[PDB]
Amino acid sequence: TTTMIDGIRTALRSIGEGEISISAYDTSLVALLKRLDGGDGPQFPSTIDWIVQNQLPDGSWGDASFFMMGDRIMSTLACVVALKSWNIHTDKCERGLLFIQENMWRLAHEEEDWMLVGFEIALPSLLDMAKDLDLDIPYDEPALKAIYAERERKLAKIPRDVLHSMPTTLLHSLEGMVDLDWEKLLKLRCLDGSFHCSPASTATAFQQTGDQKCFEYLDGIVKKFNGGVPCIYPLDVYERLWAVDRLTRLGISRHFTSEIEDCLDYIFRNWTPDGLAHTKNCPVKDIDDTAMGFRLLRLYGYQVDPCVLKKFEKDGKFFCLHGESNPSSVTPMYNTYRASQLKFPGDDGVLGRAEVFCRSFLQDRRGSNRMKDKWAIAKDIPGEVEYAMDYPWKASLPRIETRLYLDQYGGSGDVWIGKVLHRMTLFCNDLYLKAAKADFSNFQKECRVELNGLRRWYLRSNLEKFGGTDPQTTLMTSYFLASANIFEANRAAERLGWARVALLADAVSSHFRRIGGPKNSTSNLEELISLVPFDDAYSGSLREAWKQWLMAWTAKESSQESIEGDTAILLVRAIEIFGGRHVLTGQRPDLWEYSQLEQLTSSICCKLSRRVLAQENGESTEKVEEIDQQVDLEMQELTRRVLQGCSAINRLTRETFLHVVKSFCYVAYCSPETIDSHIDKVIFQDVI
Amino acid sequence: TTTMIDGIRTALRSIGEGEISISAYDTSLVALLKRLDGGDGPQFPSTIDWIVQNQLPDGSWGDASFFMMGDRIMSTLACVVALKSWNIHTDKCERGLLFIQENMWRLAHEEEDWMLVGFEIALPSLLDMAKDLDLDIPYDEPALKAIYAERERKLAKIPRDVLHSMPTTLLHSLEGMVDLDWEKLLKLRCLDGSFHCSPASTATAFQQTGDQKCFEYLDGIVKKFNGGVPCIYPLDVYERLWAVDRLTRLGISRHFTSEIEDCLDYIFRNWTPDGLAHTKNCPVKDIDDTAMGFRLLRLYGYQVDPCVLKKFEKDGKFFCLHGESNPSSVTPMYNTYRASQLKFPGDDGVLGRAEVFCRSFLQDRRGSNRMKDKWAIAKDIPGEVEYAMDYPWKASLPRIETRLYLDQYGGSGDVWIGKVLHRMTLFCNDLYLKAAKADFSNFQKECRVELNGLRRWYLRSNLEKFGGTDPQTTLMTSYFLASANIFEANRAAERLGWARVALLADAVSSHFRRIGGPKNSTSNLEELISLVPFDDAYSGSLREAWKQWLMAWTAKESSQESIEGDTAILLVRAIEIFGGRHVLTGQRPDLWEYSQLEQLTSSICCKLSRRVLAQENGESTEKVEEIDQQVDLEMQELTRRVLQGCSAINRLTRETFLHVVKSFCYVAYCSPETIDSHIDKVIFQDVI
C-alpha cells in the first residue's frame, strides 16, 4: 500500500550524514580518555551508561543476529577494560569474564578472509591494556603467537617516511601502532582533523596531542548520539549512492525522482577530477565508489569523463587501492565491469581495457566458490553476478532484472565488515521488500487480465485465417515483449496498441511469404489495419503509417533487402501516436536528431537480422563475431544519443527507441526455451 | 534579351489546333469539287487564287528550301490538272509543263526510304486524271511500271472486309484506291467525319457521298485558311508534346511553367487507357506519341500506368504500328528507350522488356548509317541518339545535355515527310535558338567571374596547408559539379556554399587519411568551418552540422564503414540551410518522408563507393554488375519518391536530393579525361 511508500519518501528526504549501527568497541576507547580540565573522572559517562544498558544475556557485546568470535572477544575486552579501569560496575566485568575465559580458545578455528582490519593490531594493544588490570587471562595461546608473527611481518613491510608523507589506509588503524611522529604525521588527517574518518585513531591521537580539531569532532559525534559511536563517520556519499542503486534495481524508483536527483546533484557538486571516497573530504579514494557513481551519473544525463580510472590501473592490471596491489574481492570489479557497459564511442579505451581484464578475472573464478567477499556478507552474490556476466546492456530487460533481484536482495540479513561488525539500515531496510513486492504482485495481476482481454480480441478478428505455427505462444511472446518495457498501469493504451500492431504485421508478413510477395498481391491490405479498435483522433495517422509500411514492403521486393527496420520504424511511430504526443515547432536540430535516431534503428535492425539469417545456416562463427562487433558500434552510438541530458527533444520520446531496440536484440539473443521460462516466471509464477 | 522570350510566351499562350505549312496538292483536289448547288464553277476559287499567286520561278510548287522530284512532280501535276480542268489561266500550265516534261526522267534516281506515303498510289490516279486533259505526256517510263507492279503487290496484300471493318492507316490514303463500299467503310472516319484527319481522302469521299459532316469540316478548314489546306489536320496533341519536349531539352522551360502545365493538363484530360494519336479523336493510335506523353507526364508528377504499352508488343517484339509489323525507324524506339528510364519499381516489367529489346535493336545499327528516318529529316540524329544511349538517367546532367543539344537542334532547317513535304514552325522556330543561346552565353560569363572569386577565396584560406594533389583541377571539378545542377543566377548563394563546404570536407578527409585517423587527432577542427564567410543567421546551424559530421568521422573509425553518405547528408543539409528554408509543423508523414530520403542517400553513397573501391582492385566484373544492379534498384526507388506530385513536402527540397545523388553517380561513372573535356566545353569554349 501507500503508507510504506510515504514513510520511505519522508525518511529519504531526511538524508543525514550517516545511518549505521552504533558500535561499542570505539566507545570503550572514548571512555578511556579522562576529563580534559584535570577532572575527577572520565570525559563523558554517557558512553558508560550506554555500555551498562546493553549487556548481553551472555554478557557479551555485539550484533545478536550473528555470532563471530573475533569481534565478540574484542568488544568484550574493550568494555571490561574500560569499565574496570574506571573501577565501576565490576559485577558486569565478572559476568562477562566467565564467557571470555571459556571462549578464549575458539579463535583458532575462524574463516579464511573473515579477518577484521587490523584485528591482529588492536588485540595486542588490547591485552597490553589488560595486563594493567591483569585479571585471570590465558595470555598463553598459539593464536596470539601467529598474529604476533604477522604483526612483525607487516611492521617490517611498512616504511617510515612514506608512511609519514603519503596518506594511506594505515592511518585508519594507527592505535595499535607505536613508534611514531606527531608533526610529520599531523597533517595526514581529513578536513575535519579526523584520520581516515575513524573515531578510534583520532581519539588515541588526541590522547597524545590536544588539538581541538579532534575534540570538537568527537564531541559532535558523541553529542549527536548521546552514548555510543560508530567505527567510521561520516558516510554521506556511500549511502547516497548505495540507496539510489537499490531503488533503481528494485524497480520502484518511479516515485522518488525528486529526492533522487537531489542526491544526484549533491554527488555531482562533490565530484572530483581524481575519484571518490565514502565521504566528501577523505583524501584517499578507491575505485568501487568511483565506478558506481560514474555509472549512475551517466545513466541520468550527466557529462563525466572516465580517465579518472587511469589512477587505479596497474601497468596492465587494475587494483582497487591506489598504490596497493592486494588480491581484490568480487564486488569492486563487479561494479567496475557493470559500469564498463555504457561506453560512449568518443571515450578513451581504458574502459575497454578494464572490461576485458575484469571479464577475464571473473569468468574463471566464477565456476568455483570465489564469490566470498572480504568486507561484506550478502544473501546470494553468485546468481546476481552470474546473470550480470550473462546478459549484456543491449540484452537487459528491466522487469526480468527486478524479478530476479527480488530474490537476491537480502534486506536486513546482511552485515558489513570493518573494525567491527556494523550494519546500515537506511538503504538495507526491509520495508523496501514489502513495497516492491506488493507493487510487483498487483502489476502481475493486471497483466494477467489484460492478457485474456487481448486473447479474446485476437480471436474475434479471425486473424488465423492467415496464422502462423500456433497463435498462442507467439502472441504471448509478443505481448510479453511490450509488457516488459512498460509496466506503468496508465500506459496500457500504448501497451495494447504495440501488441496489436505487432501481431498484425506478423500476420501480413506471414501471408506475404506464403504467397511469394507483392507481385502475387490480391487483397486491399491497407484496410486490414482497421481491425484495431480506433479512437476518434488516432485513426488517420495509423492508416497513413500502415500504407507507408506497405509501400516499403513493395519497394523492398526483388532485392537483397531485409524487412525488419521498416517494422521497427512502424512500431515506434505507432507507439508514439498512441502515446498522443507531438514534436515542437521543429528547429533544425530537432528533426535532425529525430532522423538520426530513425536511421540508426533501421540500420541496426537490418544488420542483426542478417546476422541471425547467417546464424541459422551454420555459418563460420568468425562472421558472426564480425557482425556482432558491427552492431555493437552503432549500438553504443545510439545509446549515447539517447542518454544526452542536453537534448532538445523529450525524454519518453527518447527511451521509446531504446525499448524497441532492446526488445529486438533480446529476442534475437536467446533460445525460446529461456524466453518461455522467463515469461512464466514473471507472469504466472507469483510472488509472496 | 527579353523581347524574344515575351514573343515566344505570347505565341505559346495562343496554341491553336495546329500550325503547319500550307500544302497545295490537297488544295488542287479541293478545287476539283464543283459547286454543290448545281453551280456554274468550282466550289471555292480562293484555292485557285492562292495557286496562281505562288507559281515558282520554275513554275513548280513546293518548299524552296528543299528540292525533291517525287513531291515537286505531284504538286505540279495536281495544280496543272486542276486549273486546266476548269480551263483557266492556261499560260501557267504551259509555263510549268516545260519543266514537267524535262524532269519526267529524274524520278528513277531517288533515295531508298525517301518515298512518300502512297506516292505510288496517287500518281497512277494522277496520270489517269491527266489523260482526260491528255496533254503531251511521256506516259512511257519504266519507273511507272515499277510503281504499278508495287501497286498490284499491295493490292494483292490487302483484304476486303478487314479493310471494311478494322480502321487502318490505308483510310488515310484511299483516293488512289478504287473498288470500294460506302457504308461498311462509312463509319471508319474520325469523330468529325474525317478519314484519318486527312482532307484529300474526305474530299474524294464527299465526291461520292454528300455527307454534310465532310462539307462542314472542309469548309471550316478552307474558311480558316482562306485559300490553301494542309495534308493532315489537326495536330493539337502532336505539337503540344513536341513543343514542351524542346523547351525542356532547350533549358529555357524555367519561364513558361504556366502554359507548360496548361498543355500538360490538356493532354491529361485527353489521356486514354488505350494510347494516343496526333489528334484527340483519331481512333488508331501509335506508340511514339504515347511514349513521349508518358515520359513527359511522369516527369511532372502525374500518375499514369504503362500497361498501355502492352498493345504495341508483338509476341516478343515491338512494332510502332498496332497490327502492322513493318521495319520501324529510329525515332519511335529512340523515344521509347528514353521513356524506359524513369521506371518506378511498382510497375510491370513490360518497360524492362521493351528496354532490352530496344537497346539490342539500337546498339547494333548504331555503328552504321542506320540513323536515317523514313518520315522526317533532321540536322544530326546520330550524335544525339548516341549520347542518349551512352549516359543513363542516373548519370544525366542538365547543362551538359542542353549544351550538346544546342548543336543538335536544327531549328527551321528540317522537313517532315507526309503525302507532301510539310513543315511546322510553332515548335521548330529559330528564335528559340537566339533566346537559348543568349541565355547560355550570359550564364557562362557569370560562372567565369564567380570562378575567380572562389579561387581567390580558396587561396586566402591557405587551405593547401593540408592540400591534395593539385588544388586547381579538383576545385574546378567541385565547383563544376555544383554549377551543373543549379544555373539560376539568384542561387549563387547556395552554389558557392556548396562548393566551399565541398572543398572543406575534401581537405579534412585528406588530412585524416594522411595522419591515420581520429586517434591521431590533434587540432580543433570543428572550428575550421568558420573559414566560410558567415551571415548573421546562417552561422550556428552550419557549425552544428559540422560537429555532427565530425562525430560521424569518429564513430565510423575502426570499422569497415565508408565515409561518403555522411558527406552527402552534410551537403544536402548545408545546401538547405543556405537556401534558407524550413519544414512545416511536421505531421508524421512529413518527417517520415524526410528520413526516408536521407536513409536512401546514405545507402546509395556507401554502396557505389564500395563499388568504385573494388573497381580499382581489378575485381571480377561480375561483382561490379551485381553491385550495379543493387544501386539501380534503390536508385529507381529514390527517383519515385522524388517524383510524387502527391508529396506533402516542398518541391525544391525534393530536387536537391536528386542533384546531389546525380552528381555523385556521374563523377563515379566517367574518366576525368571526359570530365575536364565537358568542363572546358561548357565553361571556356564559348557559344556564338
Author numbering:
A (entry chain A), B (entry chain B): 80 to 767
The publication says:
The large superfamily of labdane-related diterpenoids is defined by the cyclization of linear geranylgeranyl pyrophosphate (GGPP), catalyzed by copalyl diphosphate synthases (CPSs) to form the basic decalin core, the copalyl diphosphates (CPPs). Here, we used X-ray crystallography and cryo-EM methods to describe different oligomeric structures of a syn-copalyl diphosphate synthase from Oryza sativa (OsCyc1), and provided a cryo-EM structure of OsCyc1D367A mutant in complex with the substrate GGPP. The structure of monomer OsCyc1 consists of an αβγ domain and a catalytic center located between the β and γ domains. OsCyc1 catalyzes GGPP to form syn-CPP, in which new bonds form between C6 and C11, as well as between C10 and C15.
To elucidate the oligomer states and the interaction mode of OsCyc1, we determined the cryo-EM structure of OsCyc1 and finally solved three OsCyc1 structures in dimer, tetramer and hexamer forms, at a resolution of 7.9 Å, 3.5 Å and 3.7 Å, respectively. The tetramer is composed of two dimers that consist of chains A/B and chains C/D. The tetramer molecules correspond to subunits A/B/C/D in the hexamer. When we analyzed the particle numbers in the cryo-EM map reconstruction, we found that the tetramer is the predominant form of OsCyc1 and is equivalent to chains A/B/C/D in the crystal structure. In the particle picking process of Cryo-EM structure determination, tetrameric assemblies are the major particles that are picked. Combined with the cryo-EM structure results, these findings imply that the major oligomeric form of OsCyc1 in solution (as used in our experiments) is tetrameric. Apart from the dimer interface, intermolecular interactions also occur between chain B and chain C, chain A and chain C, and chain B and chain D. Interactions between chain B and C are mainly located on helix α22 and involve residues S620 and D615. In chain A, β domain residues in or near α13 and α14, such as E340, R348 and Y381, interact with α domain residues of chain C in or near α19, such as R535, R539 and E543, which are identical to the interactions between chain B and chain D. Considering the results of our size exclusion chromatography and the static light scattering experiments, we hypothesized that S674A/E677A disrupts the oligomeric state of wild-type OsCyc1. Together, these results imply that the tetramer is not essential for enzyme activity in vitro.
